[model samples]
Target chain A: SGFRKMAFPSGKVEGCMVQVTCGTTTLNGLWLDDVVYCPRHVICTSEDMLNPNYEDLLIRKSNHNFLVQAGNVQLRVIGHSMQNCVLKLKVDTANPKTPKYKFVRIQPGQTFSVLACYNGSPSGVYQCAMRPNFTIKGSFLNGSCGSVGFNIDYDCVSFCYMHHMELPTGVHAGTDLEGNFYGPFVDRQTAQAAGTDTTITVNVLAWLYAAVINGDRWFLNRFTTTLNDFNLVAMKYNYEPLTQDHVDILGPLSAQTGIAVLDMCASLKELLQNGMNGRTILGSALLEDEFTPFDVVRQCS
Target chain B: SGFRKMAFPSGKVEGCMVQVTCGTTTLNGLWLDDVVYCPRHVICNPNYEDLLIRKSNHNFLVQAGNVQLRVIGHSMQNCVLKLKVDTANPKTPKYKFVRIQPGQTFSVLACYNGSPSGVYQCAMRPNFTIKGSFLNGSCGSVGFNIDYDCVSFCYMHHMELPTGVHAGTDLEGNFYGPFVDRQTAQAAGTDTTITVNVLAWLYAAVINGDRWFLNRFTTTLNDFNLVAMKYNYEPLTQDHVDILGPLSAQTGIAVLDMCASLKELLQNGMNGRTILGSALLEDEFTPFDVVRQCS
Candidate 1:
């Protein structure tokens, strides 16, 4: 159960939603999660948008109009690392010039409501995917502040997932909690940490949690089974190293797999512990690659 | 990234492992992460099943299952707290001990399936005297109540003092004080009965400087951790609670919850296997950004 009894009983923390990082200063929340060191949506006074650093972050420069609204002590970036992060900006190649775009101030704690829409049809080359232009929505805290609303929408993208991406040989990368073709169900621990490298173990377990639970039937056809059949906790002690073939096959890792009761379980655990310190453990077990997206991995053979 | 540079690259620590907490004394590696204080796979040997004990937190006495293993607790938030696979059955009634940060103790006492059948509960550190009737997984309740707070009282009432030297908390969860700091410690001034957690002092730190502290300070930071499971963790005792509780004072940089920092660090295999960055304020904080918390 998520703990709701947030203990900030002290007065040191101000604001209805004081940014967890900085109490009351600049809103540099963009760097909150280094996994996606790039910017998603940033909130600042209109003047600051013209700031060089802010403008440089944009590939498509545009004069944006924003209206500020009241309420709340803090605002956070959620979907940035969640599965919902599938949506990206549908940049316009034709204009190539700075255009006029409309924007609005989002209240602290208001979640960015992602909307998928395209003229009369869904946009993008991948027509199967929903490329929603995002908007801001009221949060549980917004109503508490009493004034709530934000409607900023623009762009179209190709934000689709696994099996649905049947562009090639109908690849089925499994699925996620949402039943979407599962990709890397990463560890979103950018909260207290930095590079995703160090957390290869974390991402390894996260991918396995989804692989074992949601991908349970996808990997194992045995109908008579309970979740207890899978365990992600006892990997380090399993003490099995990846063989040379597995080593050469280590670079730029992804997913896929097999399920043979203990046999399959032992193998996957080995795969996970292998991911500890992702980069340094690259092929030849040297150098390193931590933050890049770790895709699918399959090993039935 | 797993701190595999191997600190004792010298010639001190040996063996695949040395029980960590006490170098090579009787293995007490079992105490690494304390919230669970129960047993599963019981390790007894990892081969055969043995009578498991529901004894209090000090020593886990399995009929024949008294072996050891250690766990890291760097990330108490995601809290991957669960029971070990039953050596006999995969879907047996196993308790899910959900150890939230610091002192919050909570557990989901259930079977792998819906109808939970709890077996027994440990009172964590025996100091907490509250007791529960001996119930088996057949049904702690009628069918059963799955959520059990095993050490709420214990954690809240656990007032035991520093029984040994403040060697520190091991990646394993064993908090070593002076006692374990020197099982063979006394004979060591000149005799060397054997200094386990005890080591020589670092009289002078002649680095970028010439002279620092009054040539004071005891033991090398690296050697201590090589003994305490390389980069275990130093608990923020009175200081943390006094200030903002794990929330550190920002040093022109980002703020870090040491509680979460240590938790996050351990969770990441102690990132290079030891305390990280300037945030935690270790004797040797790296110029490195260990506590990369967005804060």
Candidate 2:
């Protein structure tokens, strides 16, 4: 399970309401996910409104108008097993007359709150999309400041994936996650960096944690199905640019078609040399260039 | 009236069919009053399920696909103002993954397309917003090269306006016309410089030309309304924020908005100034700090 904490009267943000909901019940004392560029709405004194240039942009909550601190935002989502969904937040700057927008990922069976700040105004259209290989439903608390033009519509992307539900046209989770149709989603480098721990025990721990929270059997299958997948931490590799064995293993795993299961005892005996940390394994025919083609693929498709 | 000019296969950087329109209708084909960024379509091979990061990530055609270059688009509501939009073509290194996502701006409508050979990718995004009293739009766009794990997503932003309009809820006139929305509008510049020119006849002609195009009235209560609007061109004895004095046969026609008849004269004067030159006069009042807030 995932949990995040929030503070009230955010000194640098506004438009924040302290509330989170589960089903029809609203939780108390939670900050509004929709904070403006500055904390606590920098009262729009004519001077603040008419200030010229970036150097003059000031952030404060003296007037408490609930304005966002320029492009800063706070977001929260609650659901079950959300980590595996490839959750992302997309902020669109297409509108030139408002503060920036935010899109964030969701955590299943837990509450995930994010505080994002942009260096500019919030006048563009923005949305967030969640891409769990399997569907999971949830709610969100989010807000931003800068352009008041957003009152024309709801501030956050309106989306919730039902548990195990499929998209209308069988669209791949990867494709939809990156695509802006469900709004937009941006990457979280912090999460990526954290996701890259390279240690076997660490891999197993991460996998176990992910399985406990996300309960994705598919991921569990991948870990055991391919030696590379199971040994990623031991291999000391990070996310991105999957290796040949990784591709070979994942390519078939994604299709959900199983190959013949080998006997554990016999496999263990054959792996004596290969399993040794320093032992060099036989090189496969697939090369780096061959692996390149696999990059453009979205989701399993 | 709006028209459509389709450039098939490929064309020169200068000849692509990039223009602004209301649906298929073409407005203008030269300079534009303003422009906005529009939604970006994720790059697709069209032929392949997913190309490798190296091959697909860098290939322009494989990434951003093709574009129809059109020069200048204006609206009947805004008149003769024109705007230009660019698109990518062929396959080229320089134009790889060049796209304007939702909040990204079509920053520059250059005289020449970026790359001429192979497949060229046109960098693009949705228009930004422009509000009368508050809120302004800013954006970012970058070049792309093929790499599957790059997993780069375009910039993000929140907006107050709907698609095709700024904060004031006005039309964005496609990618080459007006502010597509608040986040997609042309960023108002703060550092503005205006050229001073005398020749009263030239001033009058320019003002009249503006009237002919944007439909803004240049005529004051008297015959000099046309002349007074251009009076800012007059050399001032001192610089003190450059306030306009009413036109008085008393002070002579030396300052703009000089006469009581010129009640709405300041607005007309601004409109006339835009027609005279490409310089953005709004920058004077827009101050760099305020403009930078949106950027």
Candidate 3:
């Protein structure tokens, strides 16, 4: 392939950043320009250039060029690039009418990791396009580097695994949940300011409830398997698995309405972390699953 | 023409109601019996007692006995019977609304106007009910049911008329009929009742005669064929016959012949211009005159 070579300044070195070019299309490595234009044009650093044994650079579309990782309701694009260039991943590009995922930008030499939730069904192929760009002349070249197309065959198991990993551990640390701020405004800032906790347990239980209800048999089985794996990982980390009483409370809440699971868990996390009086927890132990998070907050108060 | 005879009862008569009968067929002249039980059967009162006679025409079928109804002066007591008949399903002649238009009256013909029997039952008005005894002394039903306005009459009669035909109409005063379409009728505008009368009159005219009263907005050859096919009338054209609900060799041939006849008539009649004038004047053709001409 007679690749178009990008012109470089004399002071700058060539191997400082890798340039991946295809045919007449060329994308220069990250170059210092007006605003540090870095288009997913390069993947390797000067360090990777020294070791020829490291095959981190993707110079061509190969079997390994595709990265598809499943999440709870979404899929993640693992480290995948084209022509040794960083490639932005956009999932579900097959349906041009309703695009579900936006392009996830991965820095040069960094693994591309983007989250994509499943709308409903998990058995379909997740189609995506890797839009590659080049940084040259202190400006990013739009559509200069050719796109790399690939698909990920995924199911509910992958989704559950991804969802478990993707669940936010922080109660208020600008998490997607925190940003959402679903409940009352009074508790909103306090909820956000709360310390991080083991969210996987509550998230798993809540999702398990949703899966049992809305999810199909395949999803239910996958979730159960994923939860067991998650619990093993939790034990390895010395984090206690959720207690039976937690299950009894959260299970009914999850079973009642999948949406309420989030409210109950988040509210409960806040209350416990803030030091819920022993009497409040004991008193609310007999509370109905139908009771709302607001009611829980009131009881705790 | 020798008329058919019917037996009537002599009793404490109310107002005079006419009854017309021909062969086995009978139609009550307007009568008051709890509602009215004038089954074209018996037309009699104390003053008027003779054998009721039946006459049919191109547009109407009349049965008069002793009543010599003459058209001379402007008379408010002019007894008019606007018979409502269902000509769609000829097997059962269901009569409907009995509206007696005081000024409207015309003599009947020897035959029952339109063909293939049970197609329609003639009622004197758009709203009336069958009453009194069944002259033949049968069922013990005393009261009668009154069929409502002309809208009901058109619906039951031309049910095969595509809903699309009655969808909407241009009411810029260009459309000849008084009513727009079925939708407009339901909306009940100035054109509603007149539309009913126009449709009823034209339906009878089209069935009784081959001529049609078509409005540019709604009426089409396809709709006309549907109406014709429902009443077992020969469709106007081959295209008209083929596009009917279904087709077969027998029906195909029947429609072909019907179309061929019309085609020949068109070819023979100077391209339909001889029978039809170049321009239709609003004053020249009244709804009543159109019915009378067709009759």
Cα TM-score per model: 0.19, 0.20, 0.15
DockQ: which is higher, 2 or 3? Answer: 2
Compared with the true structure, all predictions reach lDDT values of 0.21, 0.22, 0.23
Tell me the deviation in Å of residue B40 in model 2.
22
Q: How much is B11 displaced in model 1, in angstroms?
A: 45
Instruction: Encode model 2's per-residue lDDT on A1-301: one tens digit a residue.
Output: 1100111111111222222222222221112232112211122233433332222222221122121122234333221111222211112221133223343333211111111122232111211112222221111112221111111011232112111111232221111211222212122111111111221122122222222222222222221334454344334433222234434433333333332221121232233224323221111110011111111121011
Stronger candidate by lDDT (1 vs 2): 2
Overall local distance difference test of candidate 2: 0.22
Model 3 DockQ (Cα-based)? 0.00
**Lowest summed lDDT over 10 consecutive residues: which window, candidate 2 chain A?**
A1-10
Candidate 2, position A96, lDDT: 31
TM-score of chain A of each: 0.20, 0.21, 0.21
For A1-301, candidate 3 gives per-residue lDDT tens digits of 0000111111111111222332333342221111111123233344443343224344444423333222122222323332221243333322221212222222111111111112111111111111111110110013222211111111101110011110122111100111111112121112222222222344334333332332212222211223344445555533346544455556454545443443444433333334323222211211112222222221111
Docking class of 1: incorrect
Q: What tens digits encode model 3's per-residue C-alpha lDDT throughout B110-202?
A: 011111000001222211111011112111111111121111111111100111111111111111123321222322122101222222232
TM-score, candidate 2, is 0.20
